[PDB]
Amino acid sequence: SMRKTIERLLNSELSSNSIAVRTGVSQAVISKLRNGKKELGNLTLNSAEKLFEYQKEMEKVDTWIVYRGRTADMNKSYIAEGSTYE
Amino acid sequence: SMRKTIERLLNSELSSNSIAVRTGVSQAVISKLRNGKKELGNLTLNSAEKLFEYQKEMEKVDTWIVYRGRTADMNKSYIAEGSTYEEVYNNFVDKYGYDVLDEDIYEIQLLKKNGENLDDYDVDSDGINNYDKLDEFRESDYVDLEDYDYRELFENSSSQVYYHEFEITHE
Amino acid sequence: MKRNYILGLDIGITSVGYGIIDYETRDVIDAGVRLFKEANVENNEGRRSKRGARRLKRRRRHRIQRVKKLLFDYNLLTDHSELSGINPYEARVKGLSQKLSEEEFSAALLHLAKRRGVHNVNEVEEDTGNELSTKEQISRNSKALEEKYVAELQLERLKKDGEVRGSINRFKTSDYVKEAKQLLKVQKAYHQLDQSFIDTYIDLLETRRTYYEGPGEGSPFGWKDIKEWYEMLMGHCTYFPEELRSVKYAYNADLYNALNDLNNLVITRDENEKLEYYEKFQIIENVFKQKKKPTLKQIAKEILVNEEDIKGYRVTSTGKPEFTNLKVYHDIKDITARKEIIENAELLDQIAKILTIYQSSEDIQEELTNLNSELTQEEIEQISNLKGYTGTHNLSLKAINLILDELWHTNDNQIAIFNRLKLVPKKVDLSQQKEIPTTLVDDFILSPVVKRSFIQSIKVINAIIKKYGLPNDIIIELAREKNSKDAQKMINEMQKRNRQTNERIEEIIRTTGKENAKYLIEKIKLHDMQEGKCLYSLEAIPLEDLLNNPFNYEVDHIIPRSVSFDNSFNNKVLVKQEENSKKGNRTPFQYLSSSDSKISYETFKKHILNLAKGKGRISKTKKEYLLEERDINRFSVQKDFINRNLVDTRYATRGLMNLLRSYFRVNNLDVKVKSINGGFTSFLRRKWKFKKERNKGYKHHAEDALIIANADFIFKEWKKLDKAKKVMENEIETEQEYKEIFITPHQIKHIKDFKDYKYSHRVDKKPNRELINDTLYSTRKDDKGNTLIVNNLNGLYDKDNDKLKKLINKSPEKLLMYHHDPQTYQKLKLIMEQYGDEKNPLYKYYEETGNYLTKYSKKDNGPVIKKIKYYGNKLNAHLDITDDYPNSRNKVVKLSLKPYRFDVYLDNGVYKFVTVKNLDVIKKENYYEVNSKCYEEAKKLKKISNQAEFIASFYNNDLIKINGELYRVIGVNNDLLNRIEVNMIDITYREYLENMNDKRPPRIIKTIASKTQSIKKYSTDILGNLYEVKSKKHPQIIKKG
RNA sequence: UUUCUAUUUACGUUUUAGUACUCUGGAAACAGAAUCUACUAAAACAAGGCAAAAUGCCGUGUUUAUCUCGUCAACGUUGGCGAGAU
DNA sequence: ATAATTATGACAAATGTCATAGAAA
DNA sequence: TTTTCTATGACATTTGTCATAATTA
């Protein structure tokens, strides 16, 4: 539960309720953290891990994907590549 | 504060009180986590970051290898220590000098590892005696020693350091 | 001539750099560095352990000789008699009964004598590498020797185990004496013996020199009797010459150390912060006489105040508070608690001295018995078994009483007591001496590295005084590292810390997604230490906000730098710009007391104390700086800060400072000498931006020294710190004023541009330095007529030693076994092939069969094989000692003749040299003289004519000039091939290779045999001037030594 | 701040000698051979230098530019002293 | 309308930071 | 002796969970 990454989620433009739904942590706790009524240090490791895991997914940018497709006989091969699966 | 690393410190042989003094956390909590009366998840990030920072240093274990070498009579003792065996050789040739180990041992091992025949270079008690040829071999890109053979460099010298005993500490 | 100048010293562990600065113009008259090979305790442990051996060998030989002479007297042993075939063990057992023939008897007596065994069981001084301690071994042997004498046990071991020698044959002298007298009582009934002979033989068998008798007559390391023994072991006290130094664990000196700690303690109370005579007596009595190990909590309870108010005490490495305890007094109370013993200072002192000097308990009990005290006989036996009293040289008792009296009455500390009393060393009269005397450095107890550095530094001072006149000011820095083993440990630890911080920084850069962390390392280090909490307002601080808006937070100093003189991260914090602006050049105490802060002082203290304990993020000094309630305006408090941060306090620097100050005061020379802390020069290096690199060679030890001298000039151009100078030699400003005072890089570019950095090295003419590496390798003769050294493979059965394997597969013909005994090679090979996978096939064989590799036998009764000998290499240089070993079929040689010096000759236009080896310098009394015959033989071996002109003679580190490139000789590599070894004068070659990233081998080796146009000799004085040396026309034969 | 000394034990590297080992001649007594591997005694264990039946004694550490003047000492060269120079 | 989001609680059950207890060596 | 070892708990405070009441486009 890196303090810096959890800090990025709390300072993100993502909604407190929206973060809460995905994290599973209460919107109340998220709001009181942004309010400062609560401190990140006093947070249970379980809750801290959930916030850290949720923030990790957003750092999936810069991906490059290649498609190798073989015809049923494994003989003729079709290959294409691009930034997003689209 | 990765749960796995804290789980590793809890599973360590270090005394609950020993970790507490170093981390600043209470022996009570560490002992209760180990007993299982307390869940690592329920711990605060503040206290867990402390236990995590402790493990970090232990996780990256740094081996310290201390060379104790006694002269044949067991009377005069030579001792050097360093991080990788290569460091042990480099300290022993600085503090106590090269002429303590057998003459020209570093060169002889390098030539042997590359695969050259030692006899051609006239290996002697003084060691490489055909300096002219050694210089040519050095010119060729030699294959360097692998930090597991500096031990061999120390244990193939009996001129003065007859009894050699290496102690390796991991922490 | 006469030029006012400031002198600066950088006294390292392997160098002493000196620098000269103009008093007026910040100029640089001369810089340099004296060098010397690192002193090591080991070498002296070498000479001493060996001396200790030669002596054991000499005493054994002398006892054998005396017994042989005695047996000639009674006609039992005669020159004609042959003692060759008699077996010692079988004869001792027979003679314990029956009769012994004249030979067998002689063999047995000579035999016991060769080996008497230990006397004081614990007297032994050795490591437990044998896995069986000496005391436990004697205990087991005695438990086995209840009804059997020594000979019986040894013979039984030889017949059953097959061995006698080893670590199992360590006995006690009493059993040997019993066996000797038992056999003699029987054998005297058949041969002509008298009780005088019996007593003489028993005496010779058990005689031994006690530790307080020393060597015999005529020894330089001896003493006439026991009073002289006290004098030698204790030594005359430097402070009062006629009085001898006392022991350290003695009660009075314990009281002195404890009172030092008690005086140092500061307690925040309505009374004075320093404790006064009456409550000091109360605390010392109660705490240090009722509890074995005093703690801070006990002090707080007895004075009934808060432990939170106690500051200024020594702390252990683990953070536990440390208080020196009256160990001897509690040890007394443990056994006996009567009043008559514990309140007698002289009795307790004498008890301590006896326990410390007399190692043997039997001597201790006797010495207390001779002391007419109130001790009872039963109590003396128990007190005699006390241990851990092992300090010999400590301040004299007469001076200890004087210091204790002043300590009791006043709240002062030792340093200022010494200044007030003006105690001056009196071992050597400073008035008569023309130059600072290097003798005084011997007395202070300093490690040999520091002693050598001090002697070299004093010689540098003498040379500079003789050359450029009297120095107006001297600044002395002793470097932090105690010895090299610490320089590496520290460098390794620092590297590890740097790596962990780099790991934090790189992870932060990725998580933030910004590169701001690259210049934000100082703040980000502070953030987690404060846990993102403004220490002045308690408000939580986001790490991301610090990267996004670095200007919203600033690195403020807890204490103003005009007094704190501390610029470490301990004195730095991350605070709100408004908090720093409101705080000013003041202390956090009065500011949190003031209404400007948005938090109360008590809550601040509570948060600081809990934070300090948690996560070890607040250092010990950090909370003291934060909670410094005492006003900085007080002169004593500013002085305390200067001493803790700017003035060195280690014993070594002080002793050198006191010696120099006493010398300058006695001669009435207006010379101010001052010291600088190790971190201050690092800070002043950092802020003047001189730290480009640390591998430019030795010129680093010079440059730092220059900066040191510059410090003096910046402590007199500004009156704001001028008073502080008067404090160091013996108002309050903001931090930007501090930057204005110290950062200013004007006339400091001179250190950057100066290039004439003279260097010098210490020539080592000492003769008898060492002769031949000791390992008496045997030799054999091969088919081709050469001679091969026979190295022996050892520890074959050990798990990690794979030598046998590698040799077997690569070259079997090298094991002597291959030809002299073939069958056994077949057994070894079959074993190596089957279990070849393991690193050590022999260990795996032992792990499955449980048998060592026995020699091949038809009956399978062969002995074990633990050493296999193998031909190794050919023989080139050797000190042939074969003459000592009689009738040797094969030669016996030693290797690596250590060269003493080499003399260069110019014959027929070509330069050759003859190596005067150390073996050719024979010693007659005081003088050391070069063996003429061996020198002539070596000269003729080099094909040198008798009219060859003599050029020079080079010892170690004498400067040589070959073909125009200067070098320093380390010693000749191979004489036959005419190769000498030189390392460059400025930077050690190993470093010269790294600054070019070259991979050439590390030792420059140059050849003088041919194509050598010039071989001149240059020499350099302790300062470092380079003067070409014109030597004498005959090589030196007699060195006074 | 922890150096400088002090006494002692067992080992240990080596040679010789002996007993086992290996081998050949050979029925072998033994004769040898080989000197390899284990024990066992004795001897040497920095080159050596004193000393003279002594609980004997020194030899791997500290201190070190070189040349010179004179002074003094050991003994001519080294000292040591001083005073210079390079 | 309406839904997602934003602020405060209540409460059972923990936690950090201090002890002590008894043991163990 | 005595001095750290685990274990257990006290207490003031804070959690996590599970609510509301409001809010705005």
Author numbering:
A (entry chain F): 0 to 85
B (entry chain C): 0 to 170
C (entry chain A): 1 to 730, 743 to 1053
Original authors' sentences:
AcrIIA15 is an anti-CRISPR (Acr) protein that inhibits Staphylococcus aureus Cas9 (SaCas9). The AcrIIA15 protein, consisting of 170 amino acids, is comprised of two domains: an N-terminal domain (NTD) from residues 1 to 56, which contains a HTH motif resembling a transcriptional repressor, and a C-terminal domain (CTD) from residues 57 to 170. AcrIIA15, by combining the HTH domain and Cas9 inhibitory domain within a single protein, exhibits dual functionality as a bi-functional anti-CRISPR protein capable of both transcriptional repression and CRISPR-based cleavage inhibition. Our structural and biochemical studies demonstrate that AcrIIA15 functions as a dimer to simultaneously inhibit both anti-CRISPR operon transcription and SaCas9-sgRNA DNA recognition.
